[PDB]
Amino acid sequence: GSGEEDEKVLYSQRVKLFRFDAEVSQWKERGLGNLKILKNEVNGKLRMLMRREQVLKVCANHWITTTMNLKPLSGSDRAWMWLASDFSDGDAKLEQLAAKFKTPELAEEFKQKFEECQRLLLDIPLQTPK
């Protein structure tokens, strides 16, 4: 009720999704897809989910909040992981899952903006015209 739904799609981007392998202790790709952003009309929670493009299937529904923190992968500077409990149909575990963009360009722009939005989006209204 205005929380687990109520989200609309504003932006989509081709990204790689990663899972943290407990057994590998390491981030390994979940696949390749498009990061779909669903944003609540309330602008309370926004999500980034990514569906595997050619795989037609969302694997991770991650909410972008300051309640969570982004951390760069080892060796990556601008590809980051977040801890989220994903269960788009990903099955509810909390994992640190990662996503990386092709370049630190895509990765860096998003990283900065991501954190800023975490602190900021909360207080600052961002409503898309209709």
From Swiss-Prot:
Q: List residues of the RanBD1 domain.
A: 3-123
> What does UniProt say on post-translational modification here?
Polyubiquitinated by PRKN, which leads to proteasomal degradation. The inner channel of the NPC has a different redox environment from the cytoplasm and allows the formation of interchain disulfide bonds between some nucleoporins, the significant increase of these linkages upon oxidative stress reduces the permeability of the NPC.
Localization recorded for this chain is: Nucleus; Nucleus membrane; Nucleus, Nuclear pore complex; Nucleus envelope
Tell me the disulfide pairings in this chain: none
Could you say which protein family the record assigns here? Belongs to the RanBP2 E3 ligase family.
Q: What is known of its domains?
A: Contains FG repeats. FG repeats are interaction sites for karyopherins (importins, exportins) and form probably an affinity gradient, guiding the transport proteins unidirectionally with their cargo through the NPC. FG repeat regions are highly flexible and lack ordered secondary structure. The overall conservation of FG repeats regarding exact sequence, spacing, and repeat unit length is limited. The PPIase cyclophilin-type domain has high structural similarity with PPIA, but has extremely low and barely detectable proline isomerase activity (in vitro). Only about half of the residues that surround the PPIA active site cleft are conserved.
Task: Quote the function comment for this protein.
Answer: E3 SUMO-protein ligase which facilitates SUMO1 and SUMO2 conjugation by UBE2I. Involved in transport factor (Ran-GTP, karyopherin)-mediated protein import via the F-G repeat-containing domain which acts as a docking site for substrates. Binds single-stranded RNA (in vitro). May bind DNA. Component of the nuclear export pathway. Specific docking site for the nuclear export factor exportin-1. Inhibits EIF4E-dependent mRNA export. Sumoylates PML at 'Lys-490' which is essential for the proper assembly of PML-NB.
What does the annotation say about its assembly with partners? Answer: Part of the nuclear pore complex. Forms a complex with NXT1, NXF1 and RANGAP1. Forms a tight complex with RANBP1 and UBE2I. Interacts with SUMO1 but not SUMO2. Interacts with PRKN. Interacts with sumoylated RANGAP1. Interacts with CDCA8. Interacts with PML (isoform PML-4). Interacts with BICD2. Interacts with MCM3AP isoform GANP. Interacts with COX11. Interacts with synaptic plasticity regulator PANTS.
Please give the name of this protein. E3 SUMO-protein ligase RanBP2
Counting on the full-length protein, the chain here runs from: 2028 to 2154 of 3224
